[PDB]
Amino acid sequence: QRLCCGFPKSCRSRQCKPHRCC
């Protein structure tokens, strides 16, 4: 889905932090 890099709500996760969108 639009998780970690899709929408910023997932960027608060440890795994999502280091993405290009995060």
Short mmCIF file of all heavy atoms in Angstrom, two decimals, unseen atoms left out:
data_model
loop_
_atom_site.label_atom_id
_atom_site.label_comp_id
_atom_site.label_asym_id
_atom_site.label_seq_id
_atom_site.Cartn_x
_atom_site.Cartn_y
_atom_site.Cartn_z
N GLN A 1 0.83 -1.22 0.00
CA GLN A 1 0.00 0.00 0.00
C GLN A 1 0.86 1.27 0.00
O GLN A 1 2.05 1.20 -0.24
CB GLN A 1 -0.90 -0.10 1.25
CG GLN A 1 -0.81 -1.53 1.74
CD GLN A 1 0.48 -2.03 1.16
N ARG A 2 0.22 2.38 0.27
CA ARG A 2 0.92 3.70 0.31
C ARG A 2 1.51 3.91 1.73
O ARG A 2 1.38 4.97 2.31
CB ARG A 2 -0.10 4.81 -0.03
CG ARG A 2 -0.69 4.58 -1.43
CD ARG A 2 -1.70 5.71 -1.74
NE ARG A 2 -2.28 5.48 -3.10
CZ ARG A 2 -1.62 5.76 -4.20
NH1 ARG A 2 -0.40 6.24 -4.14
NH2 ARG A 2 -2.20 5.52 -5.34
N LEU A 3 2.15 2.89 2.23
CA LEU A 3 2.77 2.92 3.59
C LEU A 3 3.87 3.99 3.78
O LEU A 3 3.71 5.14 3.44
CB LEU A 3 3.31 1.48 3.85
CG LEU A 3 2.19 0.40 3.78
CD1 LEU A 3 2.84 -0.99 3.97
CD2 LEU A 3 1.17 0.62 4.92
N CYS A 4 4.97 3.55 4.34
CA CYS A 4 6.17 4.39 4.64
C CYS A 4 6.47 5.53 3.67
O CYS A 4 6.59 6.67 4.09
CB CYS A 4 7.41 3.51 4.66
SG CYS A 4 7.54 2.03 5.69
N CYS A 5 6.56 5.20 2.41
CA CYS A 5 6.87 6.26 1.40
C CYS A 5 5.59 6.81 0.75
O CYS A 5 5.61 7.88 0.17
CB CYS A 5 7.84 5.63 0.36
SG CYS A 5 8.91 6.69 -0.65
N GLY A 6 4.51 6.08 0.85
CA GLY A 6 3.22 6.55 0.24
C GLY A 6 2.73 7.77 1.04
O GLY A 6 2.56 8.83 0.48
N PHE A 7 2.51 7.56 2.31
CA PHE A 7 2.04 8.65 3.21
C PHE A 7 2.85 8.69 4.53
O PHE A 7 3.30 7.67 5.02
CB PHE A 7 0.50 8.45 3.50
CG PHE A 7 0.11 7.08 4.08
CD1 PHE A 7 0.59 6.64 5.31
CD2 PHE A 7 -0.74 6.25 3.37
CE1 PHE A 7 0.23 5.41 5.80
CE2 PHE A 7 -1.10 5.01 3.87
CZ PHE A 7 -0.61 4.60 5.09
N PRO A 8 3.01 9.88 5.06
CA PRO A 8 3.98 10.15 6.14
C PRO A 8 3.59 9.49 7.47
O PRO A 8 4.39 9.46 8.38
CB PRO A 8 4.04 11.67 6.23
CG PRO A 8 2.69 12.10 5.78
CD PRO A 8 2.29 11.12 4.70
N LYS A 9 2.38 8.99 7.53
CA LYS A 9 1.92 8.32 8.79
C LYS A 9 2.78 7.09 9.07
O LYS A 9 3.03 6.79 10.22
CB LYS A 9 0.43 7.90 8.64
CG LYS A 9 -0.44 9.16 8.39
CD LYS A 9 -1.95 8.78 8.30
CE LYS A 9 -2.25 7.83 7.13
NZ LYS A 9 -1.87 8.47 5.84
N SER A 10 3.22 6.41 8.03
CA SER A 10 4.06 5.20 8.27
C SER A 10 5.52 5.60 8.56
O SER A 10 6.21 4.84 9.21
CB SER A 10 3.97 4.32 7.04
OG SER A 10 2.61 3.89 7.00
N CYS A 11 5.95 6.75 8.10
CA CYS A 11 7.37 7.21 8.34
C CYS A 11 7.78 7.28 9.82
O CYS A 11 8.95 7.41 10.12
CB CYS A 11 7.61 8.61 7.75
SG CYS A 11 7.61 8.84 5.96
N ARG A 12 6.82 7.20 10.70
CA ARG A 12 7.12 7.27 12.16
C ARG A 12 7.65 5.91 12.65
O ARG A 12 8.08 5.77 13.78
CB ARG A 12 5.80 7.68 12.86
CG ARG A 12 5.99 7.89 14.38
CD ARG A 12 4.65 8.33 15.02
NE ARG A 12 4.20 9.62 14.42
CZ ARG A 12 3.35 9.69 13.42
NH1 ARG A 12 2.85 8.60 12.89
NH2 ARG A 12 3.03 10.87 12.97
N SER A 13 7.61 4.94 11.77
CA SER A 13 8.09 3.56 12.09
C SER A 13 9.62 3.49 11.93
O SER A 13 10.21 4.25 11.18
CB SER A 13 7.42 2.57 11.13
OG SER A 13 7.92 1.29 11.50
N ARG A 14 10.20 2.57 12.66
CA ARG A 14 11.68 2.36 12.64
C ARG A 14 12.14 1.97 11.23
O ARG A 14 13.12 2.48 10.71
CB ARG A 14 12.02 1.24 13.65
CG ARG A 14 13.54 0.88 13.74
CD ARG A 14 14.40 2.01 14.34
NE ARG A 14 14.35 3.23 13.47
CZ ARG A 14 14.60 4.42 13.95
NH1 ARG A 14 14.92 4.58 15.21
NH2 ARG A 14 14.53 5.43 13.13
N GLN A 15 11.39 1.06 10.65
CA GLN A 15 11.67 0.55 9.28
C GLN A 15 11.37 1.60 8.20
O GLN A 15 12.06 1.65 7.20
CB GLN A 15 10.81 -0.74 9.10
CG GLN A 15 11.06 -1.50 7.77
CD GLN A 15 10.67 -0.69 6.52
OE1 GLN A 15 11.39 -0.63 5.55
NE2 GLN A 15 9.52 -0.06 6.50
N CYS A 16 10.37 2.41 8.43
CA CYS A 16 10.00 3.46 7.43
C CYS A 16 10.87 4.73 7.45
O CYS A 16 11.01 5.38 6.43
CB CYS A 16 8.57 3.92 7.64
SG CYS A 16 7.17 2.78 7.52
N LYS A 17 11.42 5.05 8.60
CA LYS A 17 12.28 6.27 8.76
C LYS A 17 13.28 6.50 7.60
O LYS A 17 13.34 7.60 7.10
CB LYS A 17 13.00 6.11 10.15
CG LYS A 17 13.89 7.33 10.58
CD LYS A 17 15.19 7.54 9.75
CE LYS A 17 16.09 6.29 9.79
NZ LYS A 17 16.48 5.96 11.19
N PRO A 18 14.03 5.49 7.19
CA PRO A 18 15.16 5.69 6.26
C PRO A 18 14.76 5.67 4.77
O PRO A 18 15.61 5.48 3.93
CB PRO A 18 16.13 4.57 6.66
CG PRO A 18 15.29 3.49 7.27
CD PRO A 18 13.91 4.07 7.53
N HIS A 19 13.49 5.86 4.49
CA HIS A 19 13.02 5.85 3.07
C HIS A 19 13.26 7.21 2.41
O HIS A 19 13.49 8.19 3.08
CB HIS A 19 11.51 5.51 3.04
CG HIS A 19 11.27 4.07 3.53
ND1 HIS A 19 10.21 3.38 3.27
CD2 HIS A 19 12.05 3.21 4.29
CE1 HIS A 19 10.30 2.21 3.81
NE2 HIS A 19 11.43 2.06 4.46
N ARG A 20 13.19 7.21 1.10
CA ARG A 20 13.40 8.47 0.31
C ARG A 20 12.30 9.51 0.61
O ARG A 20 12.55 10.69 0.54
CB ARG A 20 13.40 8.13 -1.19
CG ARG A 20 14.53 7.13 -1.55
CD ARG A 20 15.92 7.74 -1.25
NE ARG A 20 16.97 6.75 -1.64
CZ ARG A 20 17.37 6.61 -2.89
NH1 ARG A 20 16.85 7.35 -3.83
NH2 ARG A 20 18.29 5.73 -3.14
N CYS A 21 11.13 9.01 0.93
CA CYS A 21 9.98 9.92 1.24
C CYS A 21 10.01 10.33 2.72
O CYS A 21 9.37 11.28 3.11
CB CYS A 21 8.66 9.21 1.00
SG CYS A 21 8.15 8.56 -0.61
N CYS A 22 10.77 9.58 3.48
CA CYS A 22 10.90 9.84 4.94
C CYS A 22 12.33 10.35 5.19
O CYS A 22 12.76 10.56 6.31
CB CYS A 22 10.66 8.53 5.68
SG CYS A 22 9.12 7.62 5.38
#
